[PDB]
Write a protein that binds this ligand. Structure first.
Ligand SMILES: CCCCCCCCCCCCCCCCCC(=O)OC[C@H](COP(=O)([O-])OCC(O)COP(=O)([O-])OC[C@@H](COC(=O)CCCCCCCCCCCCCCCCC)OC(=O)CCCCCCCCCCCCCCCCC)OC(=O)CCCCCCCCCCCCCCCCC
Ligand SMILES: CCCCCCCCCCCCCCCCCC(=O)OC[C@H](COP(=O)([O-])OCC[N+](C)(C)C)OC(=O)CCCCCCCCCCCCCCCCC
Lengths: 71, 80
C-alpha cells in the first residue's frame, strides 16, 4: 500500500498538491545532477550534422555510434 | 492566426565551410537566404520605395515627354 503525500513547490509563494511518494523520490533523485547523469545516444544522420559545427566531436561521436554507446 | 507549414523548400545545410569549397553559386545562395528569412519582409520593405519611385520617374514620360506633344494649341506655329 502506497500512501499519498503533500508535495510543495516554491520558496516564498508555495503551491501544494498531492503526489505519489515514489514519484517524488524519483524526482529528487534526478535532481542529484552529480549522481544521475543524462547520456546521449547518436544516429548516423545526427553525427554527420555535428561535423558542420565541430569536426573533432564528429569523429569522437562516430566512435560512440559505432559501438552503440550512451555516453 | 492560422497554423501553416514552413514554406522553405531549399537546402537546409550546405555542410561545414571548408575554404568555400562545394558551395552553391552566389546568386543561388542569395535566393536561398531570402527563402530562409522570408520574402514577405523583402516585398513589404521595398514596396514603399518602389511605389514612390515608379510614380515620380513615370512623370519623365507621362508628365514631360507626352506633355511636349499634348498641348493641342502648341503644334500650330504663328505666321505659317
Ligand atoms: C510592357 C510594360 C509597359 C508598362 C506597363 C506599366 C504598368 C504599371 C506598372 C506599375 C505597377 C502597377 C502594379 C499594379 C498592381 C500591384 C499589385 C501589388 O502587388 O501591389 C501590392 C504591393 C505590395 O503590397 P502587399 O502585397 O500588401 O505587400 C506584401 C507584403 O510582403 C506582406 O508582408 P508584411 O505586411 O508582413 O510586410 C512587411 C511589413 C511588416 O510590418 C509589420 O509587421 C507591421 C508594422 C506596422 C507598424 C510599423 C511601425 C512604425 C515603423 C517603424 C520602423 C520605421 C523605419 C523607417 C524610419 C524612417 C525614418 C525617416 O513591414 C512593412 O511593410 C512596414 C515596415 C517596414 C519599414 C516601413 C518604412 C516606412 C513606411 C511608411 C512610409 C512610406 C512612404 C515613404 C516615402 C519616401 C520617404 C519619405 O504594393 C505596391 O506595389 C504598391 C502599389 C502599386 C500600385 C500603384 C502604382 C501607382 C503608380 C504606377 C506607375 C507605373 C509607371 C507607369 C508608366 C506609364 C507609361 C505609359
Ligand atoms: C552604395 C551605397 C551603399 C553601400 C552600403 C550598403 C549597405 C548594405 C550592405 C548589406 C550587406 C549584408 C551582408 C550580410 C552578411 C553576409 C554574410 C555571408 O557571407 O553570408 C553567406 C551565406 C551563406 O549561406 P548560409 O550558410 O548562411 O545558409 C543558411 C542556411 N540555408 C542554406 C538553409 C539558407 O549566404 C549569404 O550570403 C546569405 C545572405 C544574403 C543576403 C543578401 C542581402 C542583400 C542586401 C542588398 C540589397 C540590395 C537591394 C537592391 C534593390 C533590390 C530591388 C528589389
Amino acid at each position: 500500500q502506497v500512501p499519498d503525500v503533500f508535495a510543495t513547490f516554491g520558496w516564498e509563494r508555495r503551491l501544494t498538491v498531492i503526489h505519489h511518494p515514489g514519484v517524488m523520490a524519483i524526482s529528487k533523485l534526478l535532481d542529484q545532477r552529480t549522481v544521475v547523469k543524462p547520456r546521449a545516444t547518436f544516429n548516423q544522420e545526427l553525427v554527420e550534422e555535428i561535423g558542420d559545427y565541430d569536426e573533432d566531436l564528429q569523429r569522437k561521436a562516430q566512435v560512440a555510434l559505432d559501438n552503440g554507446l550512451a555516453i | 492566426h492560422i497554423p501553416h507549414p514552413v514554406k522553405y523548400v531549399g537546402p537546409r545545410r550546405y555542410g561545414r565551410y571548408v575554404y568555400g569549397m562545394n558551395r552553391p553559386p552566389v546568386l543561388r545562395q542569395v535566393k536561398d537566404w531570402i527563402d530562409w528569412t522570408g520574402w514577405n519582409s523583402v516585398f513589404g520593405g521595398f514596396s514603399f520605395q518602389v511605389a514612390f519611385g515608379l510614380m515620380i520617374v513615370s512623370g519623365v514620360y507621362l508628365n514631360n515627354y507626352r506633355a511636349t506633344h499634348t498641348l493641342y494649341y502648341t503644334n500650330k506655329p504663328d505666321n505659317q
